[PDB]
């Protein structure tokens, strides 16, 4: 309704001047078909021809918006139609194609090059194509080109054509108000009226009142092209949209249109094509034979006049007037860019048209770069924006590098580093403060990440890097304490906002990449800068934490799967870099696996890898022989294990017969029981010593005063009680409730504390006699059940016991579900038996025992044969319908023992296959989890860990390899070989991959047929030319 | 070079079997040594080839 109330129209009400034909009026319509003011007397009224048009026929079905407006309407009102009602964004380029209204045919290779040129130009910048509207001539070649676009490319070209309303066939077919009107793409050859072009998107059909005559659209199109060029482009750097005028052939008028474009403020560059003929070919011949612009000699002025008088069929004074207009155009020779078929004329339409916009704008290089970044057309800008030996005005590539990061310009960053914009000098503190708050590019939920950490600690919140340091440490967690939250930068933030320069810029740039989820750029930030194994492990780990936040914020479930892609990238990549490092220098690769990442909060990378929970990295071989270095400790030893260690523990002089890798002999014993193998077995024998005592004290009598047997059992529970609580109070965080939380994720730790306190509950009841001693002995017999099962943990270490311990764990969840269905069937026959065998029963709790009594162990192979069918009758009376209870037994034991228990056999059998595939690897993952914690375990025995408490307190009251920088320097040197060695073999296996070899061959053999099609035709003409002069000779 | 020398000369069935046996002997011999296990892998690879 807004279109009818804002746009106007005009209709022919007039005095009917016959002129030539009595029916044909001044407007050309029929004399009875009626219903500027000079001779047409036209009246203004609201429109009734606008909406959508459904194009019926002509191959592909497409819909084009349309409107009929007056030719005298303001271009700002038409501009607001496109941007608001038609939902069209402001274009980054305007292309205005002009040419002959007559139909013509060009060369086939010319039409293919010009066709694929205009499509590809309209995709990369998203330009607007301005045509003549109707399906005639050059516009017909445009709609044939977008016919090829609709057959092979995803895009939708904004191809807004402007035609007179009076010339289109079937005007009554196109009458409506926001109504879809079908259109016929058939054109009658007898009718002089022509249909619209089939491949168009919008129409600005302009009515001057007349029908069948042109000129109703040129002034309105010109003013709208001027009005769009006054609009500033979104780069906001001091420039409008660029406008280019593409010319194919054309007639007498297109030379004047060229003149209006060149003699305009601001000037509009023009691009002309060769081979079509007529006015484009006289422009090309004039341009090549021009010398110094308007300085044209006398032989070539006459040659221009005779070709005008021949091709355009004009007189002598008409050719001379046209040559004056050409001379006025050629004074501004620099704006014309001539495309020539073949030769050195850029071999492409789009290299001609776009660099015509560079020198046609003639702006400052900062202004020019913002256009190139707006198109993401980096191929041309490599040769244009910074061309070879081109000067550049200072102080803008740093702001343009900021624009490159926010708009995902991974390719333009490579050109800024091609100049060498110092990525550290760029990255001041306030530069990075600015980079985080900007909401350009894609969606990134760091506004939500800062939102939910202020709950635990404005729409344009000035997000500090102090705030970033906080947002990191939640998602990274642990003892990672970010270098932002150092007191150095906290003091250097409020008092200050090259000492504001970050020392290792790509490190924090990876952070700012992966928080913003631009993986394409994350990979680049990783590529450059060192500590790359660190950077990858940090990358995948954080990514999984972001996938956790996708679930916690209830973000879109898609977001989880890109981060599942990304952790499988960063994870696999980390294994690839490690594996390559193991293929060069195995020992120095281990040196890379040990050094503390002081930049990354003083933390070992292998510590970060278990925190990454990434199975495959630890599972790689170089990680495992690094773990056996810890496990074996300071002990040479060999393949033999177990036995020899027990020899050192039991027999004291065996240490002198154990190979190591009187103060040195004191140092031998000093760290012999600091070996984590030795602390393993010697904890094991002390724990078997616990069970061996604790079976005794429950099986034999227990008098009132506890014996020496029980005192040692109580001492062992106290020592493992208070040494576990040393581990909690020194377990990473400072918050006391948080250290309780840290100890709580360890599942075996939780059940241990339960049994320590449960035995201590029965300890007090046991000091007193009955009725307290009565349950004091019983509850100990429940504790003995636990410590038998706790010994399963000690089994876990072994190569072959490692699978079994956790495998029964995953089969326990499958065990749970079987218990419900077995319970139902059990309870089913359970009450069916007691409702019939004993019909007369008082309400007692002993009844519920009898439900679960006989059928439960009857599933395990004992049918209670005495009670299958109790002989009665001939004996107390047979309970009525006891001829049913043996029958229920049959259905019970058949459906349960032969179906249900047999079900728990197959669901066990094949899930065993997936879980055995992980149990090799997850065992190796759990290795570092326990090996390091034996080194952090009590030094002496647990009973002498009371002596250990003593030593600890004495030292207290009285009071990674630690490598240096130049050692570390060649450690990083070892890394940038290996990062080049990954990215050599990735495009190696991309080239040698069999499919790719097929891929390249088809494109190469594509070009074979094309230029051999040349060679046969050119040897055809060479053959005929040879024979022609052979007769002459 | 062992493949090259095995190519020439006679008694090649014999030399192939003896080559497999010496590679297995070095496989358990470096299982006793346990200095580089990548060559127990690739001496098992030499024996299997």
Sign of CA dihedral A511, A514, A516, A519: positive
Is A520 within 8 Å of A410 (Cβ atoms)?
Answer: yes
CB spacing of A638 vs B31 below 8 angstroms: no
CB spacing of B31 vs A639 below 8 angstroms: yes
* β partners of residue A247: A98, A272
- Radius of gyration for chain A, computed over Cα atoms and rounded to the nearest angstrom: 44
Chain A contact for B32, CB < 8 A?
yes
Nearest CA in chain A to B30: A639
3-state secondary structure of A179: strand
Chain B contact for A639, CB < 8 A?
yes
Tokens standing for residue A279? 């006015």
Closest-CA distance of chain A to residue B34, Å: 7
Looking only at Cα atoms, what is the longest distance across chain A?
Answer: 145
Contacts of A702 (CB under 8 A, 6+ apart): A710, A766, A773, A777
* Chain A neighbors of B34, CB-CB under 8 A: 638-639
Beta strand A49-56 pairing with A63-67: antiparallel
Alpha-carbon gap, residue A606 to A620, rounded angstroms: 12
Chain A contact for B35, CB < 8 A?
no
**Chains A–B, number of C-beta pairs less than 8 Å apart:** 5
Closest-CA distance of chain B to residue A746, Å: 35
* Chain B neighbors of A639, CB-CB under 8 A: 31-32, 34
Is A130 within 8 Å of A95 (Cβ atoms)?
Answer: yes
Is A490 within 8 Å of A519 (Cβ atoms)?
Answer: no
Could you tell me if residue A209 is left (phi over 0), alpha (psi between -120 and 50 degrees) or otherwise beta? left
Closest-CA distance of chain A to residue B46, Å: 19
CB spacing of A638 vs B34 below 8 angstroms: yes
How many C-beta neighbours within 10 Å does residue A4 have?
Answer: 14
Residue with tokens 């439900």: A851
At residue A409, φ and ψ (nearest 5 deg) are -95, 70
Tokens standing for residue A365? 């290089």
User: Which whole-number Å values give the CA distances from A939 to A175, A689, A943, A960, in the listed order?
Assistant: 95, 18, 11, 20
Contacts of A385 (CB under 8 A, 6+ apart): A365, A368, A369, A372, A415
Contacts 24+ apart (CB under 8 A), A78-83: A78/A204, A78/A224, A79/A224, A79/A227, A79/A228, A79/A231, A81/A3, A81/A6, A81/A7, A82/A160, A82/A202
3-state secondary structure of A135: coil
At residue A402, φ and ψ (nearest 5 deg) are -60, -40
Alpha-carbon gap, residue A887 to A893, rounded angstroms: 10
Alpha-carbon gap, residue A767 to B33, rounded angstroms: 59
3-state secondary structure of A17: coil
Contacts of A833 (CB under 8 A, 6+ apart): A850, A851, A854, A855, A885, A888
* Chain B neighbors of A625, CB-CB under 8 A: 37
From the list A158, A161, A141, the residue with the least C-alpha distance to A217 is A161
Closest-CA distance of chain A to residue B47, Å: 22
User: Which whole-number Å values give the CA distances from A165 to A49, A175, A248, in the listed order?
Assistant: 10, 12, 24
Contacts of A775 (CB under 8 A, 6+ apart): A762, A765
From the list A401, A334, A410, A336, the residue with the least C-alpha distance to A369 is A401
DSSP per-residue codes, A768-809? S-TTSHHHHHHHHHHHHHHHHHHHHHHHTTSTTHHHHHHHHH
Alpha-carbon gap, residue A593 to A604, rounded angstroms: 8
Beta strand A176-184 pairing with A49-56: parallel
Beta strand A336-339 pairing with A270-273: parallel
Alpha-carbon gap, residue A881 to A861, rounded angstroms: 26
DSSP per-residue codes, A494-510? HTT--TTB-SSHHHHHH
* β partners of residue A616: none
User: Which whole-number Å values give the CA distances from A585 to A359, A580, A593, in the listed order?
Assistant: 55, 9, 12
Closest-CA distance of chain B to residue A582, Å: 11
Closest-CA distance of chain A to residue B8, Å: 33
Residue with tokens 């950077």: A535
User: Which whole-number Å values give the CA distances from A731 to A113, A478, A727, A752, in the listed order?
Assistant: 70, 10, 6, 17
How many C-beta neighbours within 10 Å does residue A633 have?
Answer: 22
Q: Which of A637, A639, A644, A661 to mutate to test the interface with B (most CBs of B within 10 A)?
A: A639
Alpha-carbon gap, residue A352 to A338, rounded angstroms: 8
From the list A592, A465, A594, A482, the residue with the least C-alpha distance to A538 is A482
Torsion of Cα atoms, A875 then A880 then A886 then A891, to 10°: -170
* β partners of residue A603: A597
* Chain A neighbors of B32, CB-CB under 8 A: 639
Residue with tokens 């402001």: A90
Alpha-carbon gap, residue A438 to A422, rounded angstroms: 22
Q: How was this structure determined?
A: cryo-EM
Alpha-carbon gap, residue A427 to A435, rounded angstroms: 10
At residue A37, φ and ψ (nearest 5 deg) are -75, -20
Looking only at Cα atoms, what is the longest distance across chain B?
Answer: 36
Q: Is A686 exposed, middle or buried (0-12, 13-18, 19+ CB in 10 A)?
A: middle
3-state secondary structure of A88: coil
* Chain A neighbors of B29, CB-CB under 8 A: none
Alpha-carbon gap, residue A620 to A583, rounded angstroms: 12
* Chain B neighbors of A622, CB-CB under 8 A: none
Alpha-carbon gap, residue A799 to A791, rounded angstroms: 16
Nearest CA in chain A to B35: A638
Alpha-carbon gap, residue A517 to A711, rounded angstroms: 61
Is A78 within 8 Å of A228 (Cβ atoms)?
Answer: no
At residue A503, φ and ψ (nearest 5 deg) are -70, -30
Q: Is A514 exposed, middle or buried (0-12, 13-18, 19+ CB in 10 A)?
A: buried
Q: What's A295's DSSP letter?
A: B
**Any idea how long chain A is?**
1033
Nearest CA in chain B to A583: B38
Chain B contact for A636, CB < 8 A?
no
Alpha-carbon gap, residue A159 to A202, rounded angstroms: 7
Alpha-carbon gap, residue A561 to A987, rounded angstroms: 26
How many C-beta neighbours within 10 Å does residue A618 have?
Answer: 23
* Chain B neighbors of A638, CB-CB under 8 A: 34
3-state secondary structure of A137: coil
Sign of CA dihedral A215, A218, A219, A220: positive
Chain B contact for A638, CB < 8 A?
yes
Closest-CA distance of chain A to residue B38, Å: 10
Residue with tokens 């014996």: A707
* Chain A neighbors of B37, CB-CB under 8 A: 625
């Amino acid at each position: 309704s807004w279109i009818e109330r804002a746009f106007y129209k005009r209709e022919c009400v007039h005095i009917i001047p016959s002129t030539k034909d009595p029916h044909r009026c001044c407007c050309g319509r029929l004399i009875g078909q009626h219903v500027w003011s000079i001779s047409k007397h036209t009246q203004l009224s609201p429109t009734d021809a606008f909406g959508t048009i459904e194009f019926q026929g002509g191959g592909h079905s497409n819909k084009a918006m349309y409107v009929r407006v007056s030719f005298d309407t303001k271009p700002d009102l038409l501009l607001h139609l496109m941007t608001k009602e038609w939902q069209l964004e402001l274009p980054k380029l305007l292309i205005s194609v002009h040419g002959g209204l007559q139909n013509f045919e060009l060369q086939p290779k010319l039409k293919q090059v010009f066709g694929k040129g205009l499509i590809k130009a309209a995709m990369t910048t998203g330009a607007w194509i301005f045509t003549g509207g109707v399906n005639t001539g050059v516009i017909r070649h445009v709609g044939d080109a977008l016919k090829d676009h609709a057959s092979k490319s995803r895009g939708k070209i904004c191809t807004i054509g402007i035609a007179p309303w009076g010339i289109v066939e079937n005007q009554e077919d196109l009458i409506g108000r926001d109504v879809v009107r079908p259109y016929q793409t058939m054109s009658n050859p007898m009718s002089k009226l022509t249909v619209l072009n089939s491949m168009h998107s919008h129409f600005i059909l302009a009515d001057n009142g007349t029908t069948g005559k042109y000129g109703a659209e040129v002034k309105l199109r010109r003013q709208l092209e001027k009005h769009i060029s006054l609009q500033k482009i979104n780069t906001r750097i001091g420039q409008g949209v660029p406008v280019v005028a593409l010319i194919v052939e054309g007639g007498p008028n297109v030379i004047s249109i060229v003149l209006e474009y060149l003699r305009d403020t601001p000037p509009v560059p023009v691009v002309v094509c060769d081979g079509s003929g007529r006015a484009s070919d006289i422009l090309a011949f004039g341009h090549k034979y021009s010398e110094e612009g308007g300085l044209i000699n006398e032989s070539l002025r006459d040659q221009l006049l005779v070709t005008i008088q021949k091709t355009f069929t004009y007189t002598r004074t008409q050719a001379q007037h046209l040559f004056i207009i050409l001379m006025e155009c050629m004074k501004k020779k620099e704006l014309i860019t001539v495309f020539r078929m073949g030769s050195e004329g850029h071999q492409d339409i789009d290299l001609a048209i776009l660099t015509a916009l560079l020198k046609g704008a003639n702006a400052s290089a900062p202004d020019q770069l913002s256009l190139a970044l707006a198109w993401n057309r980096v191929d041309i800008a490599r040769s244009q924006i910074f061309i070879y030996g081109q000067q550049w005005p200072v102080g803008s590539l740093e702001q343009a590098m900021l624009d490159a990061l926010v708009l995902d310009r991974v390719d333009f960053v490579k050109l800024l580093i091609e100049n060498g914009v110092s990525m550290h000098r760029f990255l001041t503190i306030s530069r990075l403060e600015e980079l985080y708050n900007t909401r350009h590019g894609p969606s990134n939920t760091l506004y939500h990440l800062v939102r939910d950490v202020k709950k635990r600690e404005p729409p344009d919140y000035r997000i500090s890097l102090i705030d970033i340091g906080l947002v990191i440490e939640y998602l990274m967690g642990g003892a990672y304490r970010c270098n932002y939250t150092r007191k150095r930068f906290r003091t250097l933030y409020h008092n200050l906002f090259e000492i504001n320069h970050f020392p290792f810029p790509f490190h924090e740039l990876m952070v700012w990449a992966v928080l913003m989820k631009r993986q394409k750029m994350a990979l680049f930030f990783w590529q450059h800068g060192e500590e790359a194994m660190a950077k990858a492990l940090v990358a995948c780990k954080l990514c999984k934490a972001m996938a956790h936040e996708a679930s916690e914020n209830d973000m879109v479930d898609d977001i989880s799967q890109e981060l599942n892609h990304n952790s499988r990238d960063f994870g696999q990549l980390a294994v690839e870099l490690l594996d390559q490092s193991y293929k060069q220098d195995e020992q120095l690769a281990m040196k890379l696996l040990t050094y503390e990442l002081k930049n990354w909060s003083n933390a070992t990378c292998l510590q970060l890898a278990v925190a990454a929970k990434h199975r495959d990295f630890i599972a790689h071989t170089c990680s495992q022989m690094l773990l056996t270095d810890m496990w074996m400790g300071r002990l040479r030893m060999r393949k033999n294990s177990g036995l020899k260690v027990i020899l050192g523990i039991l027999l004291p002089p065996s240490i002198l017969s154990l190979e190591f890798k009187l103060i040195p002999l004191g140092r031998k014993i000093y760290e012999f029981y600091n070996a984590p193998i030795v602390k393993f077995w010697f904890y094991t024998l002390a724990y078997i010593g616990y069970l061996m005592l604790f079976n005794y004290i429950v099986l034999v009598k227990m008098e009132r005063w506890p014996s020496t047997q029980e005192w040692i059992v109580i001492s062992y529970i106290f020592t493992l009680g208070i040494e576990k609580m040393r581990e909690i109070l020194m377990s990473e965080p400072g918050k006391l409730l948080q250290k309780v939380k840290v100890w709580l994720q360890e599942y075996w730790n939780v059940t241990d504390l339960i049994a320590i306190l449960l035995f201590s509950v029965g300890m007090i009841l046991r000091l007193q006699d009955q009725p307290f001693r009565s349950d004091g002995r019983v509850i100990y017999c429940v504790n003995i059940i636990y410590w038998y099962i706790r010994l399963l943990d000690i089994f876990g270490v072994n190569k072959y016991l490692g699978p079994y311990v956790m495998m029964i764990g995953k089969m326990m969840i499958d065990m749970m579900y079987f218990v419900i269905i077995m319970l139902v069937v059990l309870m089913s026959f359970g009450v069916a038996r007691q409702a019939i065998l004993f019909p007369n029963e008082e309400p007692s709790w002993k009844l519920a025992k009898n439900i679960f009594y006989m059928p439960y162990w009857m599933i395990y192979g004992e049918v209670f044969a005495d009670q299958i069918d109790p002989p009665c009758g001939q004996l107390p009376p047979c309970k009525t319908g006891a001829w049913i209870v043996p029958a229920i037994m049959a259905c019970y034991l058949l459906v349960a023992n032969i179906l249900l228990v047999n079900l728990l056999i197959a669901v066990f059998n094949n899930t065993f296959f997936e879980v055995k595939s992980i149990s090799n690897q997850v065992w190796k993952f759990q290795r570092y989890q326990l090996i390091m914690t034996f080194h952090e375990r009590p030094v002496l025995p647990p009973p002498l860990i009371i002596f250990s408490h003593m030593t600890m307190i004495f030292q207290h009251l009285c009071c990674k390899l630690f490598i240096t920088d130049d050692e570390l320097k060649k450690v990083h040197d070892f890394e940038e070989q290996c990062i080049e060695e990954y990215f050599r073999e990735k495009d190696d296996r991309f080239n040698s991959s069999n499919d790719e070899r097929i891929r390249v061959t088809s494109e190469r053999v594509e070009n074979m047929s094309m230029r051999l099609e040349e060679v046969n035709e050119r040897e055809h003409s060479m053959k005929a030319s040879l024979q022609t002069v052979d007769i002459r000779l």
